[PDB]
Amino acid sequence: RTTPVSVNYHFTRQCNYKCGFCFHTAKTSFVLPLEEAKRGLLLLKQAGLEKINFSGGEPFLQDRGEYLGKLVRFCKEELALPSVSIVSNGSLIRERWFKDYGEYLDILAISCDSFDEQVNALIGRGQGKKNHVENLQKLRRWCRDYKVAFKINSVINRFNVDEDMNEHIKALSPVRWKVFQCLLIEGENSGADALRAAERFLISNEEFETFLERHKEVSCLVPESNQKMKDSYLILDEYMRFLNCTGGRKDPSKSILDVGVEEAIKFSGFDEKMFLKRGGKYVWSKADLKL
Ligand SMILES: Nc1ccn([C@@H]2O[C@H](COP(=O)(O)OP(=O)(O)OP(=O)(O)O)[C@@H](O)[C@H]2O)c(=O)n1
Ligand SMILES: Nc1ncnc2c1ncn2[C@@H]1O[C@H](CSCC[C@H](N)C(=O)O)[C@@H](O)[C@H]1O
Numbered sequence: 001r002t003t004p005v006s007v008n009y010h011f012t013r014q015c016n017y018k019c020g021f022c023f024h025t026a027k028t029s030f031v032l033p034l035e036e037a038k039r040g041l042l043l044l045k046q047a048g049l050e051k052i053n054f055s056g057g058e059p060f061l062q063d064r065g066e067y068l069g070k071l072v073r074f075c076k077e078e079l080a081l082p083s084v085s086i087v088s089n090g091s092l093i094r095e096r097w098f099k100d101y102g103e104y105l106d107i108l109a110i111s112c113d114s115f116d117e118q119v120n121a122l123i124g125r126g127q128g129k130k131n132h133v134e135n136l137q138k139l140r141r142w143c144r145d146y147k148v149a150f151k152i153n154s155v156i157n158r159f160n161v162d163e164d165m166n167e168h169i170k171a172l173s174p175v176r177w178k179v180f181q182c183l184l185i186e187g188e189n190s191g192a193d194a195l196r197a198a199e200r201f202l203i204s205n206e207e208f209e210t211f212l213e214r215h216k217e218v219s220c221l222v223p224e225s226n227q228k229m230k231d232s233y234l235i236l237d238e239y240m241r242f243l244n245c246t247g248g249r250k251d252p253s254k255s256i257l258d259v260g261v262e263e264a265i266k267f268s269g270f271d272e273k274m275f276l277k278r279g280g281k282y283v284w285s286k287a288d289l290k291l
């Protein structure tokens, strides 16, 4: 009964950053061959896909960004998907990629948890070599130049919960600013079998709400508490298995490449009502936006 309208494909678990709360960790080095990823994406389109978001891991890592670029163009041009988006740490994105693939990308989301360099060092977002605020503005201006909608994602955690980001976010003029409460996922950032330990990053719901109220002036803010975020996505892992988070883990279905979309998605644990409640359906085609 679940139509895969908007799906996240975490095609790699490799990353070049070390965020201490990371909930999608470097557990394998498996990435599908490009042709098999395309086959899976076609299956999703035949099942009703409208929006694909490429995630990870850091999606720009694979084949020096060309794997991601080829999938972006395939989805936009061959599948005719209404929306093709990416969530990225932004560290590896070069102007050449915009020249080659930007036409086909609706939305580029860059994760930015703080505009303070010491906070980003506490979190593990890079090694502070780049001027982070300038790099974000550089990507934002390339999104302007190459006509891609710009989005920012922030994880609200112990180290940025008191931060005032109003001016910095407005200066980047995003179409969408997703504000996530830091989320615990067993086997990723919690428990004995996890590469990360997010407990020391967590904040209460009350603290999260205080952050939201501080940023009411930002029109593009989309808030996601733990309850709004945990089960409200369709998440495909690097084997194109749906990850079910209803048990606090990322429990994989069988692969859509083996059993098909309809069989696998029955085990996704997707909460469609919450997907809608958090604003998961929106004007997501850049051709329908005013950039
Ligand atoms: N329990 C969860 C919930 C979400 N995610 C991942 O967290 C990221 C959230 O990024 P977001 O910008 O919200 O994803 P989109 O699908 O692009 O969001 P939207 O379409 O609402 O803009 C996604 O890769 C999602 O799959 C996750 O790994 N585990
Ligand atoms: N424990 C956690 N709770 C909430 N959001 C988290 C999280 N760990 C990671 N995220 C967010 O989930 C999204 C996808 S993470 C993978 C994409 C890319 N490496 C990136 O960081 O943007 C990012 O916006 C990231 O900041």
Ligand code: SF4
Residues within 6 Å of the ligand: 015, 016, 017, 018, 019, 022, 023, 024, 056, 057, 058, 089, 111
């Ligand atoms: S949240 Fe940080 S560590 Fe996790 S995949 Fe994104 S950049 Fe990498």
Ligand SMILES: [Cl-]
Residues within 6 Å of the ligand: 045, 046, 079
């Ligand atoms: Cl079609």
Ligand SMILES: [Cl-]
Residues within 6 Å of the ligand: 223, 224, 225, 228
């Ligand atoms: Cl919320």
